Design a protein around this ligand. Structure first.
Ligand code: ATP
Ligand code: CFF
Ligand code: CA
Ligand code: ZN
Lengths: 606, 145
């Protein structure tokens, strides 16, 4: 470490003196650091935050600057672990609070699925909903995100259970890369299928060989990879959605009191389905609070007789159970039988299956599995997997969303086109039947206007697609009996059906695509030019160099707020400081005005 | 290099006529716009190729007999016999045709696949001609604007 050159000679000899004396001219740096650094870090973190607080609160203090320059090392070391939050409601002034952030929490935040959830949440909150419920949406996002990062950190019978759990965790971890592998193998199998020729038999031996065996291998490999993808999704993202649904129904029971006072409406099929889980054994399987049943019963039983409530929630009397446990805790343990019969709650499993099947992404994966099975039945069905690139890429997803964004108006315009084509059809059928002859030879004429159904189907199929209209696909009206009438007919058809209605139909989708692109660009611009927490203008921080960068990095940071919530949850309630306890009580009462939505620390003082 | 190749064959001097694009600002703007949205343009072209491939496999499986280009009663020129030929034909002809793929194939008078073939042609015209090609054109026009 003299070659390392981290200290001066005095510090080197001090470290030698404090070094473990092996009495054999040796030292064990592992045990040395384990003994010294950890208490040093845990105790000096408070010193570092004290110096940081003094520096931020006390400007233009030369002595304090000397202390900071002497303590540069500790501040630099603890800079990643130091988190800063601004709170408005504290004494009606903006106040800065400092806390500790774990490197494990930072890594879990950097996990890819957490980042994907973050970007989806930001898009949802910025594009729609405004800022009226922005704080509530942010708090819900924080709860779901900390649950997601806890799940990620989590990611002979005992041996096999451990092995299968490890396999499931591996699939959950490698869900995305295996998804890309599935896309690549789908592209390869489609490339192989491209060399197909009819002989009724669909012979693929266009080349010398080595195509059918590898095609079969790629098909079975694709099916296996798709099954593994669905397993990984089930063990990765299903817990998050079921946790969200359980939280929603539990909060409805607590605050709204849905299944207690007034039953959900019949149109609320989601509420009707959720009625099934409010009475099973493990209702809050993923929700952190397992006492929601006791809370709702203590809330409403004294008014509703406690008996209907006890029956509808199960478990009988929560108050009686709590009293019995408090008087004497159950001094026994239930042995885990190997061949235990129906240990799981069948009703809860049915509810979970219902919600995961109503989920959209799981439906897409089920469709992928079905397409793979149909591809095994007939190899040609693998072409449907080529549309996964639309999900993969954002622009293609934007086009697929735009094709349905204006669905109602598009359907109405198509209906109007059908109606006007029908009117032209009946006019032609009544007056211009003889002109619709497609027989090029003097053989039996092919009148398309003899029958109304045929005439209308012909009009819709041909006139709309034709650039010139209907007049370009029928005999010219040389006869003077209907010359001008037929010409006006054709011109009106061309004007109203070709260059107006079809133009509007095209413009609806093109404008939907443009509007979606503009919305995404506007979300990005807002994120770049305003602060999520407070909303102060970008220029005010730009008054100083990189002022907005600093404000969004350390002053108001979404990760910092999430880590502060995690810190409050992890800390013991008795150990909470004044500001921490106030914020915790506010979060419990669901008020959410501690966020400095109005002002900032700088506008408060400097 | 173009001048040297022009000495090798005088006809290579035609490539120098593109220097006006560098010379004038508006022409340079068009040449920059043709690549400003390059990533999205490539993605849209890929989506067009994918959808044309899907229509190709559908036609190959069900509507092979309609793709006859033999005007005389001589040996039929089936363009749908081979998948590679059918897909290349679709990409080359259906995209360029204003009416879609139904205007370059035999009309489905037979009742066995009348409605199926008509829906096929209408969907091809709607999704490939008046949507995807429109988006591809609009990308470059909007980049120029
Ligand atoms: N907590 C915040 N408050 C206010 N503005 C913020 C906050 N976090 C980020 N921003 C702003 O959002 C801009 C876009 O960066 P953002 O932090 O949203 O994405 P990123 O983390 O860099 O990207 P990615 O998720 O792709 O890795 C930043 O330049 C910053 O101005
Ligand atoms: C009170 N509380 C929470 O509020 C919480 C939590 N996990 C997430 N959240 C939001 N846990 C475990 C918890 O005890
Ligand atoms: Ca205390
Ligand atoms: Zn801010």
């Amino acid at each position: 470490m003299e070659s390392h050159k981290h200290y001066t000679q005095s510090e080197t000899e001090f470290l030698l003196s404090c070094a473990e004396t092996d009495e054999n001219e040796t030292l064990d740096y592992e045990e040395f650091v384990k003994r010294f650094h950890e208490p040093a870090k845990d105790i000096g973190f408070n010193v570092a935050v004290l110096l940081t607080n003094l520096s931020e609160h006390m400007p233009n203090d030369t002595r304090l600057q000397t202390f900071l320059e002497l303590a540069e090392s500790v501040l630099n070391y603890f800079q990643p672990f130091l988190g800063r939050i601004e709170i408005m409601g504290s004494a009606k002034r903006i106040e800065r609070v400092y806390f500790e952030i774990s490197e494990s929490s930072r890594t879990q935040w950097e996990k890819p699925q957490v980042k994907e959830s973050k970007r989806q949440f930001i898009f949802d909150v910025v594009n729609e909903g405004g800022e009226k419920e922005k704080m509530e949406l942010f708090v819900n996002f924080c709860e779901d995100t900390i649950f997601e990062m806890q799940l990620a950190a989590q990611i002979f019978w005992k041996k096999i259970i451990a092995y299968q759990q490890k396999l499931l965790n591996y699939f959950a971890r490698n869900f995305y890369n295996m998804r890309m592998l599935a896309l690549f193998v789908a592209f390869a199998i489609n490339f192989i299928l491209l060399f197909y020729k009819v002989s009724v038999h669909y012979v693929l031996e266009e080349s010398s060989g080595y195509m059918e065996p590898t095609l079969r291998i790629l098909a079975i490999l694709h099916t296996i990879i798709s099954f593994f993808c669905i397993i990984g999704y089930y063990c990765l993202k299903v817990p998050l959605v079921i946790f969200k649904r359980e939280k929603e129904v539990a909060r409805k029971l607590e605050f709204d009191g849905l299944y207690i006072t007034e039953q959900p409406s019949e149109d609320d099929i989601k509420g009707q389905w959720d009625r099934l889980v409010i009475n099973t054994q493990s209702f809050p399987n993923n929700y952190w609070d397992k006492f929601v049943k006791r809370k709702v019963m203590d809330k409403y039983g004294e008014f509703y007789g406690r008996d209907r409530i006890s029956e509808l929630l199960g478990m009988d009397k929560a108050a009686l159970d709590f009293s019995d446990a408090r008087e004497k805790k159950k001094p026994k343990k239930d042995s885990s039988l190997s061949a235990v019969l129906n240990s799981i709650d069948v009703k809860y499993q049915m509810w979970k299956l219902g919600v995961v099947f109503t989920d959209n992404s799981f439906l897409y994966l089920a469709w992928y599995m079905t397409m793979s099975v149909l591809g095994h039945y007939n190899n040609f069905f693998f072409a449907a997997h080529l549309l996964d690139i639309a999900m993969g890429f954002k622009t293609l997803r934007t086009i697929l969303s735009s094709v349905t964004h204006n669905g109602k108006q598009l359907v109405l315009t198509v209906g109007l086109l059908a109606v006007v084509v029908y009117l032209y059809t009946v006019v032609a059928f009544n007056f211009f039947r003889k002109f619709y002859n497609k027989s090029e030879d003097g053989d039996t004429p092919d009148m398309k206007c003899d029958d109304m159904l045929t005439c209308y189907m012909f009009h819709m199929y041909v006139g709309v697609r034709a650039g010139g209209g209907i007049g370009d696909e029928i005999e010219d009206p040389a006869g003077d009996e209907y010359e001008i009438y037929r010409i006006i007919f054709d011109i009106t058809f061309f004007f109203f059906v070709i260059v107006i209605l079809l133009a509007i139909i095209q413009g609806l989708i093109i404008d939907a695509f443009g509007e979606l692109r503009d919305q995404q660009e506007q979300v990005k611009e807002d994120m770049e030019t305003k602060c999520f927490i407070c909303g102060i203008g970008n220029d005010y921080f730009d008054t100083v160099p990189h002022g907005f960068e600093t404000h969004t990095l350390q002053e108001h940071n979404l990760a910092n707020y999430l880590f502060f919530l995690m810190y409050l949850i992890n800390k013991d309630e008795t150990e909470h400081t004044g500001q921490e306890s106030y914020v915790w009580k506010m979060y419990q009462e669901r008020c959410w005005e501690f966020f400095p939505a109005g002002d900032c620390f700088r506008k408060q003082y400097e």
